[PDB]
Amino acid sequence: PLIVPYNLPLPGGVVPRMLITILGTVKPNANRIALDFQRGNDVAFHFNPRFNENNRRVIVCNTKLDNNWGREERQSVFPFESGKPFKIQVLVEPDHFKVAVNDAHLLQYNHRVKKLNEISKLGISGDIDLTSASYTMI
Ligand SMILES: CO[C@@H]1[C@@H](n2cc(-c3cc(F)c(F)c(F)c3)nn2)[C@@H](O)[C@@H](CO)O[C@H]1C(=O)N(c1cc(Cl)cc(Cl)c1)[C@H]1CCC[C@@H]1O
């Protein structure tokens, strides 16, 4: 059990076959969660569950370059529940991030930021109790 916000170092950035696992529990009155894979100030991959955007639940993904958000990729399939334990797994592949939640595939996000070996931090924020954040190579 760790304090949020939390920054997990990714030394030398990410590489294909790297599997990042975030474990925690969604808070009971959760509104938002974010994962931010950063290259300096740039956000290579922002993964953002929203629990109440116009009274519905949505996953928003985007990239931030030079402090500007790009074109959003949205998904209505929403595997999180307020109050429940979750596992987010981000698998780095050569051309995309692949996300699975609770062992079920959720989405893919094509690499907009190309310098994977400079994506050297993961920020974790929002309405969760964070249990652990770690990575391994599959
Ligand atoms: C509130 O800003 C959103 C961004 N964001 C979220 C968080 C955040 C999340 C957490 F879970 C958390 F815990 C935390 F601490 C911080 N920090 N930054 C990002 O989530 C960003 C992703 O595109 O969206 C921003 C956004 O809400 N919009 C937005 C989209 C674009 Cl492209 C351009 C601008 Cl100027 C705005 C709206 C406008 C209308 C529809 C669109 O979705």
Q: State how far the alpha carbon of 72 is from the alpha carbons of 32, 52, 58, 78, in Å.
A: 16, 17, 12, 16
DSSP for 7-65, written as a single string: EEE-TT---TTEEEEEEEEE-TT--BEEEEEEETTEEEEEEEEEEEETTEEEEEEEEEE
Closest CA to 11 of 120, 137, 128, 124: 120
Q: Which atom of ligand 1 is nearest to the CA of 69?
A: 32
User: In angstroms, how far is CA 89 from the centroid of its own chain?
Assistant: 8
Assess whether the previous peptide bond of 94 is cis (omega < 30° from 0).
Answer: no
Q: Report CA(46)–ligand 1 centroid distance (Å).
A: 9
The label of the residue with tokens 């996000």 reads: 109
Q: Which atom of ligand 1 is nearest to the CA of 50?
A: 11
Resolution (A): 1.2
Backbone angles phi and psi of 131, in degrees to 5: -90, -45
Q: What is the total count of domains within the chain?
A: 1
CATH number, residue 124 = 2.60.120.200
Q: How far apart are CA 137 and CA 25, in angstroms?
A: 24
Q: How far apart are CA 59 and CA 48, in angstroms?
A: 6
Strand partners, 73: 61
Q: How far apart are CA 92 and CA 74, in angstroms?
A: 19
Closest CA to 18 of 103, 88, 95, 97: 97
Q: How far apart are CA 89 and CA 38, in angstroms?
A: 17
Residue 137's domain spans which residues? 1-138
Neighbours of 106 (CB within 10 A): 19
Integer-rounded Cα Rg, in Å, for the chain is 14
Closest CA to 130 of 30, 19, 13, 14: 30
Q: How far apart are CA 113 and CA 20, in angstroms?
A: 18
Measured from CB, residues less than 6 Å from any atom of ligand 1 are 32-34, 46, 48, 60, 62, 69, 72, 125-126
The label of the residue with tokens 């596992």 reads: 87
Q: Which atom of ligand 1 is nearest to the CA of 71?
A: 32
